[PDB]
Amino acid sequence: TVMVNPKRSSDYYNRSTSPWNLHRNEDPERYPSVIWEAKCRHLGCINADGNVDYHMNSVPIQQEILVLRRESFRLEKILVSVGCTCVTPIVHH
Amino acid sequence: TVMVNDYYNRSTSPWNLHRNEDPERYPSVIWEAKCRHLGCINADGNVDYHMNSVPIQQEILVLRREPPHSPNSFRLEKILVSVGCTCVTPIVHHV
Ligand SMILES: Cc1ccc2ncccc2c1-c1ccc(O)c(C(=O)O)c1
Ligand SMILES: Cc1ccc2ncccc2c1-c1ccc(O)c(C(=O)O)c1
């Protein structure tokens, strides 16, 4: 026991070859109550012609973050998606 | 005041993880991303500067010992962390 005293400001989500949207994650018993989580727009990645390359993969980049939960509060560690990256698939065993 | 109790090696914008350690902080250890290249990896496996690797930055909540060195009193603080990298067009679309 111890004592303790959203925005989208980057355009990377649209300029990325693995672009992403944001989804509202809301929990009234949590601080922050509203978290915006990334969801990749495509299964594949966008090529230089602007079309989807289904061979590559858009995958979410996750971060472990601290949140406060009403329980007087209790500290929790959760995983949130912050954006997406484009990867070459695992193609061997 | 309250009381409290490989995929990136495969990315076209790969990154390496770096230890951010602060004993005055909870969590003490945060693993941050540093993009490996300024370009992105092309289909030949080389760095290509027609596109750029950029680090996605996220504002995260953290506990800071207040007063310093205290084992049971903290202040809520927000810091900017690099979580991973994505591959972007070097151009922007707004004025
Ligand atoms: C990321 C992106 C988004 C929208 C596009 N819309 C039309 C055409 C290309 C687009 C690209 C894109 C992808 C890969 C690339 O290599 C390049 C590039 O080389 O500019 C551009
Ligand atoms: C991401 C990645 C990582 C390592 C590689 N090492 C050798 C060759 C290509 C590599 C690729 C890569 C990049 C873009 C791509 O478009 C493709 C692909 O289309 O296969 C593959």
Phi, psi of A81 (to 5 degrees): -90, 130
**Structure tokens of A12?**
């990377």
d(CA A22, ligand 2 centre) in Å = 27
Kindly determine whether residue A4 and residue B56, on different chains, have CB atoms separated by under 8 Å: no
Q: Which residue of B has its CA nearest to A40?
A: B86
Resolution (A): 1.5
Spatial CB neighbours of A41, under 8 Å, sequence gap ≥ 6: A19, A20, A21, A58, A84
B50 three-class SS? strand
DSSP letters, A15-75, are HBSS-EEEEEEE-TTEESSEEEEEEES-SSEE-TTS-EESSSEEEEEEEEEEEEEE--EEE
Spatial CB neighbours of B43, under 8 Å, sequence gap ≥ 6: none
**Structure tokens of A50?**
């602007």
One-letter amino acid identity for B9?
Answer: N
Q: How far apart are CA B47 and CA B35, in angstroms?
A: 12
Q: How was this structure determined?
A: X-ray
Spatial CB neighbours of A47, under 8 Å, sequence gap ≥ 6: A17, A53
Q: Is B63 exposed, middle or buried (0-12, 13-18, 19+ CB in 10 A)?
A: buried
The domains found in chain A, sorted by start residue, are 12-87 (2.10.90.10)
Asked if residues A37 and A62 have their Cβ atoms less than 8 Å apart, the reply is no
Asked if residues A58 and A39 have their Cβ atoms less than 8 Å apart, the reply is no
DSSP-assigned beta bridge partners for residue A81: A62
**Structure tokens of A39?**
């969801």
CA nearest to A81, candidates A53, A49, A66, A59: A59
B85 three-class SS? strand
Q: How far is CA B62 from the centre of its chain?
A: 14
Distance from CA of A63 to the nearest CA of B (A): 6
Q: How far apart are CA A21 and CA A8, in angstroms?
A: 10
One-letter amino acid identity for B41?
Answer: I
